[PDB]
Amino acid sequence: AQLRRVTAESFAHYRHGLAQLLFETVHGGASVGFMADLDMQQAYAWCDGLKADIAAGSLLLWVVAEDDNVLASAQLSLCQKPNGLNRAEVQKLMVLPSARGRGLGRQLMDEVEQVAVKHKRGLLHLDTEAGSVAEAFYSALAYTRVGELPGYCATPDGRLHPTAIYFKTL
Template identity: 50%
Template sequence: MTVEALDAGQVLGRSGELAELLVDAVDGGASVGFLAPLDRAGAQAWWQGRAAGVAAGELALWAAYEGTRLVGTVSLAFPDKPNSRHRAELVKLMVHRTARGRGLGRRLLDTAERAAVAASVTLLHLDTETGSPAEHLYRTAGWTRLGAIPDYAASPVGVLRPTTIYYKQVGAAALAGEPSGG
């Protein structure tokens, strides 16, 4: 498997493949911000809308391929406020159902964390559905659970579910041994 950063043109050019991955994630029950059934055209339009953020440097996106088939993504969303340029939000970590259980989620997570350090980001944060398989990945990768918010987002079938917030200090902050909470 290979993981590569996508530029804005690639996001547009591969929006169909990205849409197929997003539809698979939602169909598989992943709480990634969409309700089922998610139509391919809507998913493709959503991805096409991300190209401007990639072009502006507000969003970094990586895609994972098994051969030529897109099987995963992860993104970092960078805030635009001057007092928060040291942090980024990890978003849309998705692995196609046929590619799960082979370490791809961890590889994508590691890619985003290394890129954050290279961009002088020292704090990452994310939210995920409480009790989801993703929680195990984040805990075993050294992320710290901050807490859960009840009824934060609807699952793909429309049921309100709690969301757990995680964070991780990376780069200089992690090396300095600053407290990570816990």
């Protein structure tokens, strides 16, 4: 497996693997923006929705892949607001259920941080389901927990839960 930054030209190659990754992550129970009704057509639509921003460079996308087999992915959304050029949001960090516990998440976040700095972003922030494995993961990676917002979103099963806000100053 190799860590790769996705570009407009390599997007098609990774499209299916990224869609499958969202699919498996959602059905594995994670709160990443979708409900249990998620099907592959919806996952492909989500993927296609990333293409314009990836080509523009406002959204950065990485995958850890073995050829076209996508094992994990992460995204960095660069704030485009005139007064927000110091910040970026980390989103959609996901590792296939069967590829977890092997350091892929850390590999991705290390790259995300390095590239955020190249883009002169001093603040990385994100939000994740409170109490989830992701919370232990970000804490382990030295992100600082700000607090929670109750009823922020629902797990795929429809149950509302709090989201925890984390940040790291680079």
